[PDB]
Amino acid sequence: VFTDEELHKKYNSVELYQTKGSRDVPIKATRTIYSINLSVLVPQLIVTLPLNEYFSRVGGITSPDYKKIGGKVIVGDLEAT
């Protein structure tokens, strides 16, 4: 997964590349889903980690003249808790 040559290799080639995916939806047309190689998603894991856990809470105060930023954005879970 993590190798100094595997992390320096590119993907803008005909030989090696990324491969898309797709999964269905209830009434809408079939939306795509992107499959990223796990070598270059771990560098996204290390720096986006205090943003996935921070907006995971459910409570928040949404005022425009409030200085904070966490209450005004919210990302829910898969199932409605």
Added chain:
Amino acid sequence: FINKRIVERVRVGQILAVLNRRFVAYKGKMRIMDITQSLKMGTKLAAPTV
């Protein structure tokens, strides 16, 4: 009978006999603007929070 000089016949020399009102006019190169609505501009200082 109405005691108001509404209509009088008059000579053509006394046409300019009604010029007795002191009018006060303003210059064309100055400006006049209404700042009545300018008494409501202003932001509210919020309190510092924790």
